[PDB]
Amino acid sequence: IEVLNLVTGPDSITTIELYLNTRMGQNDESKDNYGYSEKVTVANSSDQDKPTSGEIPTYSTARINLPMLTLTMWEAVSVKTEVVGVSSLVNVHMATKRMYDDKGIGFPVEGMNFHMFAVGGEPLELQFLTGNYRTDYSANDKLVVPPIKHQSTQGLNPHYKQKLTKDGAFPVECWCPDPSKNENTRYYGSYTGGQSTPPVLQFTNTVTTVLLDENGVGPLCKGDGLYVSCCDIVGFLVGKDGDMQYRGLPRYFNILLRKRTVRN
Amino acid sequence: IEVLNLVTGPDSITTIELYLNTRMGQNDESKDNYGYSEKVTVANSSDQDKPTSGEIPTYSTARINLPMLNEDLTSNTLTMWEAVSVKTEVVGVSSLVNVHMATKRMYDDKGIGFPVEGMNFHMFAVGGEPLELQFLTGNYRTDYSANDKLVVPPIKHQSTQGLNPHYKQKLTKDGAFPVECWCPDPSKNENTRYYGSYTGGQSTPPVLQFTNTVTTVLLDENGVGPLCKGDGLYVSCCDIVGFLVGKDGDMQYRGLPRYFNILLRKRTVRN
Amino acid sequence: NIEVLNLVTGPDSITTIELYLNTRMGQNDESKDNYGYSEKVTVANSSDQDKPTSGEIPTYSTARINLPMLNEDLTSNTLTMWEAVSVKTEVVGVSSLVNVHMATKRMYDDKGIGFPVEGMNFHMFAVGGEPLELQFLTGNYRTDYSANDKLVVPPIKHQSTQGLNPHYKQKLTKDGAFPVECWCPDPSKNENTRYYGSYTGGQSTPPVLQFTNTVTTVLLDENGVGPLCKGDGLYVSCCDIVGFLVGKDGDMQYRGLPRYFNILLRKRTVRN
Amino acid sequence: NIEVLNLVTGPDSITTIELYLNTRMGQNDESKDNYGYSEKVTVANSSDQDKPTSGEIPTYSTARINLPMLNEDLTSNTLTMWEAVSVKTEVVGVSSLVNVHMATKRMYDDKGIGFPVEGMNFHMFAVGGEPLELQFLTGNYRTDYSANDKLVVPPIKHQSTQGLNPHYKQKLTKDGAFPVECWCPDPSKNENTRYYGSYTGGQSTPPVLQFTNTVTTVLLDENGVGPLCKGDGLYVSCCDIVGFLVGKDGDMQYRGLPRYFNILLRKRTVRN
Amino acid sequence: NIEVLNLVTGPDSITTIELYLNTRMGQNDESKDNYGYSEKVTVANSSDQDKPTSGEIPTYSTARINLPMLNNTLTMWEAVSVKTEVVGVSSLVNVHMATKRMYDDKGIGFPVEGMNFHMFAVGGEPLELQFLTGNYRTDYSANDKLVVPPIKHQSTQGLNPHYKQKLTKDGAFPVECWCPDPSKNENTRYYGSYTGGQSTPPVLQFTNTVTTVLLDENGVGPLCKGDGLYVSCCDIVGFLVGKDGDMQYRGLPRYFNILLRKRTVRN
Numbered sequence A: 001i002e003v004l005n006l007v008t009g010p011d012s013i014t015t016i017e018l019y020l021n022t023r024m025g026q027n028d029e030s031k032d033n034y035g036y037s038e039k040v041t042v043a044n045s046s047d048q049d050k051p052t053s054g055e056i057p058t059y060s061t062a063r064i065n066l067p068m069l070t071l072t073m074w075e076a077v078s079v080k081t082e083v084v085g086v087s088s089l090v091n092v093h094m095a096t097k098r099m100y101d102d103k104g105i106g107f108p109v110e111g112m113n114f115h116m117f118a119v120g121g122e123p124l125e126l127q128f129l130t131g132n133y134r135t136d137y138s139a140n141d142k143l144v145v146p147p148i149k150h151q152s153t154q155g156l157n158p159h160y161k162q163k164l165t166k167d168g169a170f171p172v173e174c175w176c177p178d179p180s181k182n183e184n185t186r187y188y189g190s191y192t193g194g195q196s197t198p199p200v201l202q203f204t205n206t207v208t209t210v211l212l213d214e215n216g217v218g219p220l221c222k223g224d225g226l227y228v229s230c231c232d233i234v235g236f237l238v239g240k241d242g243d244m245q246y247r248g249l250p251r252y253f254n255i256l257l258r259k260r261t262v263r264n
Numbered sequence B: 001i002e003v004l005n006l007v008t009g010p011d012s013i014t015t016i017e018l019y020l021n022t023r024m025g026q027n028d029e030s031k032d033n034y035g036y037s038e039k040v041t042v043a044n045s046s047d048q049d050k051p052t053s054g055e056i057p058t059y060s061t062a063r064i065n066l067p068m069l070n071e072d073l074t075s076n077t078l079t080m081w082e083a084v085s086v087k088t089e090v091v092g093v094s095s096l097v098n099v100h101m102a103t104k105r106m107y108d109d110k111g112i113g114f115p116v117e118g119m120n121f122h123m124f125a126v127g128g129e130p131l132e133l134q135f136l137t138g139n140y141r142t143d144y145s146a147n148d149k150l151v152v153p154p155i156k157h158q159s160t161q162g163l164n165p166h167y168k169q170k171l172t173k174d175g176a177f178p179v180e181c182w183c184p185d186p187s188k189n190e191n192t193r194y195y196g197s198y199t200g201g202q203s204t205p206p207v208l209q210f211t212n213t214v215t216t217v218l219l220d221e222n223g224v225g226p227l228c229k230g231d232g233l234y235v236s237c238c239d240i241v242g243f244l245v246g247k248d249g250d251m252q253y254r255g256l257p258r259y260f261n262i263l264l265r266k267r268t269v270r271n
Numbered sequence C, D: 001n002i003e004v005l006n007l008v009t010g011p012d013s014i015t016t017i018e019l020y021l022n023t024r025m026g027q028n029d030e031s032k033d034n035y036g037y038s039e040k041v042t043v044a045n046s047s048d049q050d051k052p053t054s055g056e057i058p059t060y061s062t063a064r065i066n067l068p069m070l071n072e073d074l075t076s077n078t079l080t081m082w083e084a085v086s087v088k089t090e091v092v093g094v095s096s097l098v099n100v101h102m103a104t105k106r107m108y109d110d111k112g113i114g115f116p117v118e119g120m121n122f123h124m125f126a127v128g129g130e131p132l133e134l135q136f137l138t139g140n141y142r143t144d145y146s147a148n149d150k151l152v153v154p155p156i157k158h159q160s161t162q163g164l165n166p167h168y169k170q171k172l173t174k175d176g177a178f179p180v181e182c183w184c185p186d187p188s189k190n191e192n193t194r195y196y197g198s199y200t201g202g203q204s205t206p207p208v209l210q211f212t213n214t215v216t217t218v219l220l221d222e223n224g225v226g227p228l229c230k231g232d233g234l235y236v237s238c239c240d241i242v243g244f245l246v247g248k249d250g251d252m253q254y255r256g257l258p259r260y261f262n263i264l265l266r267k268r269t270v271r272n
Numbered sequence E: 001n002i003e004v005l006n007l008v009t010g011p012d013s014i015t016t017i018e019l020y021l022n023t024r025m026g027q028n029d030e031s032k033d034n035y036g037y038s039e040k041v042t043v044a045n046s047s048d049q050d051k052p053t054s055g056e057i058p059t060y061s062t063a064r065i066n067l068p069m070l071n072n073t074l075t076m077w078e079a080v081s082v083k084t085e086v087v088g089v090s091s092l093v094n095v096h097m098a099t100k101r102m103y104d105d106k107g108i109g110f111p112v113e114g115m116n117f118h119m120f121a122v123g124g125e126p127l128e129l130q131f132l133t134g135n136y137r138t139d140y141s142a143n144d145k146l147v148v149p150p151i152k153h154q155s156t157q158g159l160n161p162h163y164k165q166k167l168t169k170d171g172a173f174p175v176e177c178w179c180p181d182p183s184k185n186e187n188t189r190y191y192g193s194y195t196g197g198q199s200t201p202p203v204l205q206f207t208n209t210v211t212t213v214l215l216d217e218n219g220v221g222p223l224c225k226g227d228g229l230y231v232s233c234c235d236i237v238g239f240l241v242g243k244d245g246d247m248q249y250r251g252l253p254r255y256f257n258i259l260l261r262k263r264t265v266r267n
């Protein structure tokens, strides 16, 4: 796409506001354990590594329809994004394991944190890479994973790619952003691991993330579609007996877009 | 609100100074355990999750009356106070340098008492109207009925473990809205600025700063600060600095007060 | 209160003050053992019998420094005041914490290192043109300080002092006497002082410390005005707790370090 | 050594190189199980019998990339060289660490999560116009590498190599062969290479990782000159250890992740 | 003392100095085993019998470098900036040494871990030291090569300005009782950090892309008196934990690339 000048004047700007609910594994808002995974299980061996249905976090994603419009395209300029419900983690009276010989607080949601978001003018492009090439996803046929397994996928094998085109279906554990593509998407992510690690989270309505690239051009929304993707794991809830479930939080987005003239 | 020009000259600026005491659960300044929660308890099961009265931190909030500007409210333009900036600090951080209280102690009862430690949660908001809240909870079934002074939704549903926009409120009462189930609504709060952080874990070291030298700008991207509707300035916060661990392992939230110095200027608006 | 006018320019319009303050951890006599540490920490049996032993309570370090006298003529329109512009401040003796051979508890079944000084860190300093203004606030309103009557504490106790009760205030006017645990900077005053503090808590937390002679802290406020030294007095306060020393039997003592200050001041005309 | 003149302008004066490098943790064959991990870690009985097993030691990843061929000769007054201006680099597959169902040790009496990959992190990359220059330095001068004759290590051992002995140098000229544990970037050379590295140690330390496609790292030095590609070769090197996988019985293996690079280069006139 | 005038411009007005300093953790002989480590740490039975063994005490590394000879005015070399790095960080990626190990003797060997102490100084004269110790009674007589004060006093657990020195000898001034004197060192820049605790993860960086500016607030760098450049450092990266729980400090070398320029001063 050859990018030309900005379209100026009234109605040259628009904003899109949305939220995405977490996809930790139990993704149905009407059912038990919503916003958590099912109980985590552990493989007996690497050749019998078959996660139960609903114990695997997936990416959240949506395509948003923009106002219908050389051609003109919507250009994403900036985004204000926040994790919602951080204060919900200030809760140590739930039915959990507890400190100091059953006299102390319940364990707060704690441990692994994974936070990412992406804003682009087309689906986020994915690279397959896994800690175990033999992982068997057949307990849940709604998960999108490659049809074949190979040893090489514990590293970067460029023959194993995808696009994030379905909410609550692409496991985070085996799909990551493809850094060799995504020219029309901006993504940002972080991971803090360990077993019981303190979550460290911020929330504010005052921070704007600029989406323009080094040439001053933001994602250009092909077919008037804006693509938003994320995942926000804030830790594990530790049940009385030591059973553990991922806990995720929703993410809010306020995206500013402007009209851009392009060739063709 | 259509915003017009700043009013210039003498008396076009004013400052508001206040503090808010913490609302950790024992919120009566004449009683023992003020500025702490009651002892934390743990639910027998998620269907019988009924916190005891006073064990739940709530937001601190106040509405401050500003100097009246408009004699006639029906005139063509009005003047409003616009919050430009705030200097805010947590008070009494040094109070956490105390390891001789009646607490669990280190090294086979020969070492220090456990300092207040663990979960930290720090947030403040300054706006021209009440902070707008979104309901979201770790347990949709939580039963708040041991304390009918707590403001919570009148019905519960599974969906509130995520973001369900049908469950909203406004922070209109001090010491009443639980932090654990209410957060700032990011889809609103156009006229409020809020800032918050959480550091979790069990025994985590608190990491705290205090200074009188930092100014937080409240002007938005268009150079407009919160506009104080009906000459009311709204200030909200929560500052949990950890748990006090009693001899037997019983634990209580500890909170600290927060100080605010807010600078405001006169702004002409269309009426 | 003070209407600030223009800077005085030219020779002798600038001066610098250099000092250090030794730590006041509880054993504050430089001729005795355990100097720069507290006495052994003790733990209350209950909150109504919370009576710290003499010398187990850290206090603020403070000093007033006399500046060159300026105004002989008090009848003119204007006076001159010293204005603190900036300070270079450092914790001294950080390297002293590189010591794991002292008589302490030790790692790995009595074969490993002695425990280094570790745990709670508390670091604050203040530079102002009058005494640091204090607010009382305590973790335990019933704390009984009467084992050491040299501590400056309020004469009455009340439940409300576990929060901010503005009836309980003081000024930091004595070195080694105001407990850190119950006095903090009063944020509703101190217009003429700049203070900076941090706390890192927990039980055995690694101290994280920096020392350099290359960092200048600007004391000017948002209007470009530094602390103005009333009666030609410069007030410097601090506290620097770097952790606990853990004795063989588990007995623990606060350890503090000295702080150095190099303060630059300039002449400022004010309205009289 | 190289006198740098003006930029060459006009068509074909810019070029970009894009690649990835797979990790070399020890099992470096992409057709075998445990690819991108080390073999099980073993521990020497004593420092004079410290002989790591074949495949348990991480090595640097490296490649030399051919750039569009330029004219080299002794007789011209000036030549053109490729100058590396900037690089976008990222660790790939960070999300793969969101996995606690692998056959591992587990939390809370066999009812909790599997241990995630955790512990030691080591992250470094280099971009230069010639091989990364290495300095030998080891925690144990007697380490015996003879279980794997494909490793490049010095032919003689000496006590002094537990410090900096400048007689022990090399160049990173082979992928998956130079152990991280005994080779580091030589800071006394590498004038024509930019390298960046970090280490976070400890036993079970949480990995702290970031990934984004929005960060450009400028390779120009303080004089505005990037690495100059001798013999039209661009050299890219890295190592990204993200922790250990802890097997059921406590057996542990290094885990590494691939790194992506997008390097921008421009034609530079130099004196010949 | 020194009135600083203008920079000398033109050819040969700049020079660079490059060196490294090997660590002085206690076993400071490069021909012997345990080089770049301390001897085994021992622990006093009481504070009045606190006598570290010979070789268990880290000391500062230091060197004086001779600059090109120059000389009403004189010319001095002015240190403008330094690129400095800890060398051999990657050496800490080693968990197969003869050490204590994780998970019931099946896991990794403990990496070097715990206390970190990192400092460097660049100046135009010896680094000026202040004595300060955690234990005034520490007895250094097991190693008479250590430079320590000849008398002990209670006051030295704080700042006693009567106890000073200059860092004039490599591998001799213990870190545990000497620190930079902040009341002097007008002609030296120093930078230091300490991360304590028992088993703390070391957190270390290495790059050849970071320049530290040595100019002060007035735009003046250290001025090299008698054409001498003084470089000092200490870089402790943790402890090696032996099979039996015996522990030794581990240190790493530091590299320096210092840029200097000619400065006219009043004579």
Ligand SMILES: CC(=O)N[C@H]1[C@H]([C@H](O)[C@H](O)CO)O[C@@](O[C@@H]2[C@@H](O)[C@H](O)O[C@H](CO)[C@@H]2O)(C(=O)O)C[C@@H]1O
Pocket (backbone or CB within 6 Å): D041, D042, D043, D044, D045, D049, D050, D051, D052, D053, E096, E097
């Ligand atoms: C770093 C090192 O020297 N590793 C040794 C290794 C260790 O000494 C041992 O594994 C402790 O972790 O021992 C190796 O040889 C072993 C024999 O010494 C043992 O008696 O028999 C084993 C057979 O199951 C084993 O082969 C090893 O683990 O492979 C050799 C290695 O250099």
Ligand SMILES: CC(=O)N[C@H]1[C@H]([C@H](O)[C@H](O)CO)O[C@@](O[C@@H]2[C@@H](O)[C@H](O)O[C@H](CO)[C@@H]2O)(C(=O)O)C[C@@H]1O
Pocket (backbone or CB within 6 Å): C101, C102, E041, E042, E043, E044, E045, E049, E050, E051, E052, E053
């Ligand atoms: C820091 C200190 O004072 N170190 C002592 C050391 C310690 O008291 C002890 O090793 C605890 O780690 O003791 C030294 O002398 C030892 C004798 O006290 C012991 O009875 O026998 C030991 C056998 O080697 C040894 O002689 C020491 O370990 O060298 C002396 C040292 O200054």
Ligand SMILES: CC(=O)N[C@H]1[C@H]([C@H](O)[C@H](O)CO)O[C@@](O)(C(=O)O)C[C@@H]1O
Pocket (backbone or CB within 6 Å): A040, A041, A042, A043, A044, A048, A049, A050, A051, A052, D101, D102
């Ligand atoms: C990753 C994996 O293979 N998980 C499997 C688990 C675990 O091996 C054990 O529960 C120990 O957690 O066992 C199952 O019978 C189960 O719980 O449904 C099958 C499941 O596929």
